[PDB]
Ligand binder design. Sequence first.
Ligand code: HEM
Ligand code: HEM
Ligand SMILES: Cc1cc(N)nc(C[C@@H]2CNC[C@H]2OCCNCCc2cccc(F)c2)c1
Ligand SMILES: Cc1cc(N)nc(C[C@@H]2CNC[C@H]2OCCNCCc2cccc(F)c2)c1
Ligand SMILES: C[C@H](O)[C@H](O)[C@H]1CNc2nc(N)[nH]c(=O)c2N1
Ligand SMILES: C[C@H](O)[C@H](O)[C@H]1CNc2nc(N)[nH]c(=O)c2N1
Ligand SMILES: [Zn+2]
Lengths: 404, 404
Amino acid sequence: KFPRVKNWELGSITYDTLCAQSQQDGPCTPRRCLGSLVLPRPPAEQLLSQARDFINQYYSSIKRSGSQAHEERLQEVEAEVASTGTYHLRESELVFGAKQAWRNAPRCVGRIQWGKLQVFDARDCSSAQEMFTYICNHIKYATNRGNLRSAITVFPQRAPGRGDFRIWNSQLVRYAGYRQQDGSVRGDPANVEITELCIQHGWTPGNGRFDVLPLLLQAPDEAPELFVLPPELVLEVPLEHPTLEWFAALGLRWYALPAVSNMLLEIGGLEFSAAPFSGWYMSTEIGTRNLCDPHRYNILEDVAVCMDLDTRTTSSLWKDKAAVEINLAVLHSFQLAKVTIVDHHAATVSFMKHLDNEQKARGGCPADWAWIVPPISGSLTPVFHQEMVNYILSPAFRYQPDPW
Amino acid sequence: GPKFPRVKNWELGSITYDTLCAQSQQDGPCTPRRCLGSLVLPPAEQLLSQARDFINQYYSSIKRSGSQAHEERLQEVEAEVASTGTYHLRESELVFGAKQAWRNAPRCVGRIQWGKLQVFDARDCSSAQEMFTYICNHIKYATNRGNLRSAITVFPQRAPGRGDFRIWNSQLVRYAGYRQQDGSVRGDPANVEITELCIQHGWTPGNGRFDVLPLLLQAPDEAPELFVLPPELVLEVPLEHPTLEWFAALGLRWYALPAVSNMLLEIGGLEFSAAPFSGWYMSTEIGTRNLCDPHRYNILEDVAVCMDLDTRTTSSLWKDKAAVEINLAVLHSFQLAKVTIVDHHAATVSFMKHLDNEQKARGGCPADWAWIVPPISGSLTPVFHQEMVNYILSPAFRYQPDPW
Ligand code: HEM
Ligand code: HEM
Ligand SMILES: Cc1cc(N)nc(C[C@@H]2CNC[C@H]2OCCNCCc2cccc(F)c2)c1
Ligand SMILES: Cc1cc(N)nc(C[C@@H]2CNC[C@H]2OCCNCCc2cccc(F)c2)c1
Ligand SMILES: C[C@H](O)[C@H](O)[C@H]1CNc2nc(N)[nH]c(=O)c2N1
Ligand SMILES: C[C@H](O)[C@H](O)[C@H]1CNc2nc(N)[nH]c(=O)c2N1
Ligand SMILES: [Zn+2]
């Protein structure tokens, strides 16, 4: 049953025994693999057993498995679920759970950092106003003048009687997308809809290519509220190129802080609908995907023309050439601005080490090959050559529907 | 909606559903518990129903399903199995099954060409010497002085209590890999074992980085015989760069004809253990994988030193720059020598067109995302953004164990 896992550069072999701890089904069956889809489409005893498993994971982590603290905490959980149909985590438990959700995230290549996570307990939040304050602290902390620090802030869990705490934005920092008369988009095409929502709720919009969006924050069962981030909290990096003087004239820039804000955090069967987290960028996210994706800023052609490349044929490799300069520009500019960035070689090399650490520690690591391999120069990185097993462990981050 | 996998393109936002996967009669490696999609390698009762399915497929494809000739062919197939334990394909059935196997191959991006395949029937072949003649005709035909033509030569099928026809080499044309006195390898490190098997069977070896290997050909129940390809038959392309003048001095080269020779061709339960097939190259196969893989020629550093890059640090993207030029050199040299090649941009754009063709014709196309997406410039190609469903259809090419 246990899958044999080979690295093809090195000829080495491991066996994933960790996958036996999965309690949640992915999208594949023996008839067909759907491993490449991005998104595929409680009652007391089910919660109670997810809770026990997690409490068990927690006492294992602190080497107190079977002790008196462990025993009585299980009793406390059974007592609370039996009476109320739910329960609550202690702060240390939450801290362990948040790190473990990151650790378990098959699509994250930055997991060597997993144990280094500042966890802000925001479960004593009763308003969108308070959410904003908490969010501003997270950003201030996480940014740290360019010396970025991984952080998560956790707002109040879901409850059966009421609506969720939610952040409408998919990240804490995002650029606006304005549909134009002419049918094109100024700004980021990925954010057209959230830009339109911000306007609908009273935002006076800019008209630039990089207008930081405001936040729509939603307390249970209320209209979302609009909050503009103080601009001094939002660190941005102007993009120049080491050798190409003209590159700066493109006026391209990106924000320092990658911070997901619409994923659900699940710990011990409890669900945290608003729990934004941030780390630091790997350069290809910006250099390749955000700037060069055809459904994003789509700047490749512009850059190739600047580079006076032959755009008439594909075989001149003008796309590859321009894409490299752009990734180079992102790395250079971040390093110049003294803002933390990792390149895809450094990142994937450290992910290989993480795979080795996890093998010894846990007997495996869930990993999504298509997400782990970078979007340029795939086979030039060691992860390309590494077979990977993908499965869902809890604690987990999940996707959740947009609240509108 | 529909109870078949929903399949999304993220560049375009368009949706399809795959209904072809319903036809799959063979389980892959994945289960709901865990996806294994990134793994490289993972009596008469059974034969007769496979045969029936194939005959049904043939008859549907010529629009004569349910007809008297369809039923008589079914009856003829049953009788032949009933008395001999096996059966035999009519000529046009083999032609159809061979193309269908190419059409069904999830790992091939060149499938838009599937309808154009020269099928050479070599089911009369009765010795190792004749296999050689057949193979020489294939190479001459397929090479066509650089205007390459897809072809497959089919030798006799596995028999009950009778040895297989086998080609021992993994491709018709491959370079030697000589294990050096100091652990390192001269030539292609992927070919150490086969090289050593050639020497063991009486080949006098060269001392070069690019020595074309001899063929080890095995008739049923006989030891393999060694055959040297006449060099006038093996078209090679010396590698040079359009602007970097020193690149020619590296003395790199590659062969024109990519020809898989150790795969099993399965058709209606019949097994063709010797059925070598060939197409033409996608440039990344040579420029990226064969030349730059750490476990192949590993020339990235050498080229980056020539290009005067900073190889002491990852963030100079020296690997990415050198890789781009090596690929460009491959494209340019093949073009100069008038030998067919396709770049990873054109290949993938044409594979997208193939997915549309197949949606309309069969209701889907089995595709292995990890293999379809090229090893450089991944997200710059349209296939990165296209979700794919992977499943096994028959007729098929299979991996098979090495005969020794
Ligand atoms: C510390 C530096 C970090 C780096 C360099 C990093 C890198 C990455 C990259 C490149 C991806 C793929 C992103 C994409 O292509 O959309 C990713 C995904 C992800 N990361 Fe990390 N990450 C870091 C920190 C974190 C932290 C702190 C967390 C949570 C505590 C986290 C959780 C996730 C999750 C849940 C995904 C999947 C996102 C999705 O499926 O939409 N990462 N990361
Ligand atoms: C016409 C030009 C063709 C092109 C451009 C092409 C392209 C490719 C590429 C890039 C791969 C992946 C190779 C690798 O990374 O190892 C591949 C795999 C494959 N191709 Fe095609 N191909 C062509 C013709 C053919 C033909 C004629 C056949 C057989 C009838 C074929 C059958 C296959 C099969 C079975 C694989 C899987 C190989 C494996 O798993 O080892 N292709 N093709
Ligand atoms: C925490 C962290 C570190 C890092 N280096 N980089 C990141 C980028 C995030 C993750 N992944 C993209 C970025 O976030 C973008 C917003 N995510 C929305 C969810 C989503 C998902 C799929 C398809 C969709 F249409 C929408 C996060
Ligand atoms: C027909 C055709 C067209 C084309 N453009 N390109 C090709 C390259 C073939 C396919 N794929 C690599 C090349 O052939 C190499 C032979 N591979 C043996 C099987 C194998 C599998 C995994 C790991 C291994 F070590 C060995 C064929
Ligand atoms: C269809 C395909 O799964 C999709 O384009 C994925 C591929 N791999 C990825 N890998 C990362 N890191 N991020 C992505 O957005 C994607 N997109
Ligand atoms: C581990 C991974 O499956 C392996 O390195 C695969 C990835 N994709 C590939 N894709 C192609 N076309 N050829 C290959 O050899 C590989 N190698
Ligand atoms: Zn799968």
